[PDB]
C-alpha cells in the first residue's frame, strides 16, 4: 500500500526528519533493518572516523518541500505479509 501524502509530511520549505542509506558495502539481505551509521570507503585509501575524499556519511536527507513536483512528493507506504503454516491461523474474519 502506498499513498501520496505531502499535506501531512512536507513541512513547508522542507522536511528533514526522513533519512535513508545510500552507501553500504553489501546488498541488503531480505527483511533486515540496519540502523547503525558509520563511514564508508571508496576503493583504496580508506577512512576511519574521518570525512572527505573516499569518505561519506551514509544517511542522506529528503528535502520534502510542498513546492516540489509530483515525482518528488512523499509517499506513506505500508506493507503486509501473510503466510500459511501448520499453526492455527489466528487472524481472519469468519471463524464460525
Amino acid at each position, epitope marked *: 500500500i502506498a499513498w501520496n501524502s505531502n*499535506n*501531512l509530511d512536507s*513541512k*513547508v*520549505g*522542507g522536511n*528533514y*526528519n526522513y*533519512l535513508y542509506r545510500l552507501f553500504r558495502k553489501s546488498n541488503l539481505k531480505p527483511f533486515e533493518r540496519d*540502523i547503525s*551509521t558509520e563511514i564508508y570507503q571508496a576503493g583504496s585509501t580508506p577512512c576511519n*572516523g574521518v*570525512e572527505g575524499f573516499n569518505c561519506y*556519511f551514509p*544517511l542522506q*536527507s529528503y528535502g520534502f518541500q510542498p513546492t516540489n513536483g509530483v515525482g518528488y512528493q512523499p509517499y506513506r507506504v505500508v506493507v503486509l505479509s501473510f503466510e500459511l503454516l501448520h499453526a492455527p491461523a489466528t487472524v481472519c474474519g469468519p471463524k464460525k
Partner: antibody
Amino acid sequence: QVQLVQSGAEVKKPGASVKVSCKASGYTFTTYAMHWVRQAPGQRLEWMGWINAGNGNTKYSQKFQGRVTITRDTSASTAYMELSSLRSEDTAVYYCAGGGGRRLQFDYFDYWGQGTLVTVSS
Amino acid sequence: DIQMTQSPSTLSASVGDRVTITCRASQSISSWLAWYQQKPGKAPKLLIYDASSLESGVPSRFSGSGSGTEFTLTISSLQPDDFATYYCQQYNGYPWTFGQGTKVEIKR
C-alpha cells in the same frame, strides 16, 4: 538522564563576534539533534537553528541568514556556535537543546541547557 | 509564516481547580504543536507534544486536545507546581514561532 551544560555569562560589544558552546551527555549518539534557540529578555523566544550532530548538516533561520554559524566537535561531542556582527537588540539568553535520542530527528526541544547570558553593550 | 496568538493573555485560578488554555493559529495546522511550561528565572519544560501526547515524567493532570486550528490545554487539579507561564509552539511549517505567554496567579 541526558544532560546539557554550556559556558557562562559573557559581555560583548557592537561589531564584535561571539562564540557560545555546550557539551552534551548522551547515552546514544544516534544523529543527535543539537538545536539552538534564543530568548530576548522576557519577550518572545525566537529560534536559532539546528546543526546535524550526526554528520554535518547546518540548517539555519531566515532572520539570522548570513551571519550565524554553528558546528560541533565529535570526540568532545560538544556543539559550538558563532554569532556575528552583534548589535544592541542582540542582548539575550541563549539555549542549547534537542536530544531526540529515541528517534533520529524531531522539531521539538526536549533537553534544554540551563542557559547562557550575552550582553551587547558599548 | 505561521501565525501564532494565544488566549487569554493572563488568567486566574486557585489551588485545586481546572484552567483552560487556548492557542489560536491563523492558518491550518495538522496537530503540529507542543505545550511548554516556563518558571521565572528558568529553562523551559515540555509536557505536550503533537497536540495530544503526554510526554513521560509529568503529572497526569496535563492533557492536550484540539486539532485543526483551535488548540486547548487542560489540567484537572491545580498544584502550586503549576504556577508559571505556558507557551504553545507550532511545527507544521517553517520558521517556527511561539505564542504570547499565559500565566496563572494566586486568587483570593
